[model samples]
Target chain A: RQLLRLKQMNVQLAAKIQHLEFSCSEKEQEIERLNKLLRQH
Target chain B: RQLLRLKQMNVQLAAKIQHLEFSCSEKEQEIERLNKLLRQH
Candidate 1:
C-alpha cells in the first residue's frame, strides 16, 4: 500500500519536473535569441 | 558563449532532480516499514 503511495508521489514529482522544464525551456530559447542579436551588433 | 553555459547548468539541474528521486524512494520505504510495525502494536 505504501509502495503504491510512494510511486504515486514519484509520478507527481516527475510531472512537476516536466512542467518546470517547459517554462525553463521557453526562457532558455529567449536567452539564446538575445545572445544571437548581441553577437550581430 | 553565455547561452552554452546556461544550457550546461540546466543539464546539471536535470541530473540533480534524478538524484533527489532516488533518495526519496529510500526514505519512503523506511516510513512504510515503520507504519507496518505500528499497526502490529
Candidate 2:
C-alpha cells in the first residue's frame, strides 16, 4: 500500500534534503564570509 | 504562572530539538549515500 513511488519518493525526498542542505550551507558561508571580512578590516 | 509555562515550553522545545537531531542524523546518512553514489560515476 505505502511502498510505491521517481525511483519514487525516496529520490524526491533526497533531492529536497540536498537542496535544503545547500540553501542552509549558503547561509553559513555568508556568515563565514562576513566574519573573514571583519577580520581583514 | 506565565514564567512557569515559559520554562515548560523551553523544556518541550529542547526535547523536540533533540528528537529532530536524531532524525536529521539518520537523514544525513541518505545524503552520504547519494554523495558516494555520485562520486562513483
Candidate 3:
C-alpha cells in the first residue's frame, strides 16, 4: 500500500517534468530564432 | 541585460527540470523493482 502512493507520486512528478521540459525546449528554440535575427541585423 | 537574464533563468530552469526528471526516473525504477520482487513471492 505504501509503495502505491510512492508510485503515484513519481508518476505525477514525471508528467510535470515532461511538461516543464517541453516548455523549456520551446523557449530554447525561440532564443535560437531570435539569435539568428540578431546576427542578420 | 533583460534578454540575458531571461536566457539564464530559462537555462537554470531547464537544468533543474532535468535533474528532477532524473530523480523521478530513479524512483520509478525502484517502484518497478519492488513490484517485481512482490510478484516473485
Candidate 4:
C-alpha cells in the first residue's frame, strides 16, 4: 500500500495530461488540478 | 519527472480513491493515501 506505483500513474495520466495539455495555460486550471490531486488524501 | 501524468493516473486513482472513500471515514486514512503518493519519490 505504501508503494508509489509511478509506472501505473504514468500510463494513466499520459492520455489525460496529453488531452488537457493544450488547455493547461491557465494557472487556475493547474491549481485545480493540483488541488484535486492533493485531495487524494 | 514529477511534471505530469493524467489519463494513466486517472484509471489508477479511480479504483484507488473509490476504495479509499468507502474505507475512509477518518482523515487519518486520507492522510495515509496522500502520504502514500508523496512517498513515491
Which candidate number would show the highest DockQ if scored against the true structure? 4
Comparing 1 and 2 on lDDT, the stronger one = 1
Sorted by TM-score, highest first, which candidate order results?
Answer: 3, 1, 2, 4
Comparing 1 and 4 on DockQ, the stronger one:
4
For candidate 3, the docking band is incorrect
Interface RMSD of each: 20.6, 16.1, 19.8, 15.1
**Which sections of candidate 4 miss by over 4 Å?**
A1-41, B1-5, B25-41
Model 2 Cα lDDT, one tens digit per residue, A1-37: 2332213444555555566666556555655555555
Candidate 3 regions off by >4 Å?
A: B1-41
DockQ of each: 0.02, 0.03, 0.04, 0.08
For candidate 4, the per-residue lDDT at B23 reads: 39
Estimate TM-scores for all models. 0.48, 0.43, 0.51, 0.23
Q: Is the docking of candidate 1 incorrect, acceptable, medium or high quality?
A: incorrect
Off by over 4 Å in 1: A1-41
What value does DockQ give for candidate 4?
0.08
Decreasing lDDT order of the candidates = 3, 1, 2, 4
Greater lDDT among 3 and 4 belongs to 3
lDDT tens digits by residue: candidate 1, A1-41: 55535455556666767766565555556555554555554
Residue pair clashes in candidate 1: none
Model 3 Cα lDDT, one tens digit per residue, B1-41: 55555555555665677786675555556555555555565
